A paper describes a structure:
The OBP3s from both aphid species have a similar structure to other classical OBPs i.e. six α-helices connected by extended loops, with three disulphide bridges formed by the six conserved cysteine residues between Cys17-Cys44; Cys40-Cys101 and Cys86-Cys110. No significant internal binding pockets were predicted by CASTp37 or SURFNET38 for both MvicOBP3 and NribOBP3.
In the two molecules of the asymmetric unit of MvicOBP3, each chain partially occupies the other’s groove, with Tyr30 inserted deep into the groove, forming an inter-chain hydrogen bond with the N of Phe5 in the other chain. The N-terminal residues of the other chain cover the second face of the groove and these symmetrical groove interactions form the centre of the monomer-monomer interface. The two molecules are related by very close to a twofold rotation of 179.4 degrees. PISA predicts that an interface of this size is biologically relevant rather than being a purely crystal packing interface. The interface generates a pocket, which assessed by CASTp25 has a volume of 390 Å3. The MD results of MvicOBP3 showed that Tyr30 is displaced towards the protein.
Residue numbers in the entry:
A (entry chain A), B (entry chain B): 1 to 121
The structure:
Amino acid sequence: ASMRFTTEQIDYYGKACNASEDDLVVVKSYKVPSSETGKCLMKCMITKLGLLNDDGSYNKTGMEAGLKKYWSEWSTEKIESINNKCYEEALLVSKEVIATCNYSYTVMACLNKQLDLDKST
Amino acid sequence: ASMRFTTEQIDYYGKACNASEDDLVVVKSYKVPSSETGKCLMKCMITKLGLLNDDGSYNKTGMEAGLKKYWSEWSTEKIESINNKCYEEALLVSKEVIATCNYSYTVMACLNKQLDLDKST
């Protein structure tokens, strides 16, 4: 289990976020694109999904709703537990950090770690 | 379609390649780790899968065999077409480029672009 994005999602939010195809295939290769647009793609995508607020901060209720909508395979129990843990880590971040395009990857790393660790039933 | 790795593959080849969990969750978040070991993880993994030679260069027959093994939902015809194209691109790359850790991501990106252009098979 991981926070996988499908080809369809990548293609849709790639249009929404003005990515090139080269940006998109680099994302799908597990890498952050080097273009100006491509390095902010992830932020743009997960904001449009409601996982982040427009200021870039973790949105607790939006994250839950998005996980339930698109990553329901994780189970509601694990979703609630992981979301509480990652939100709690989010509280400790500065405004400066949240402003960057990289913060999105930080959040996703947290969700992926906690998914690797969570034992909720 | 993309050259997706499963959570189990990432875990296995993470052990094989001496990655830390923080490295692995950054890969699963679609980012290259900045650690010395982590930034080489992809290379190490796809070398162990036989897609690259031990010297880092593209292995035509090993790529075809890995495609057929690990991504067997794709037709032989699609596999051979993406392999031929991305091998042809590989022939133009220097020894200095193949020596890098990042070249692996470039190979993955080429395969991912050719996958996006051959969905009818």
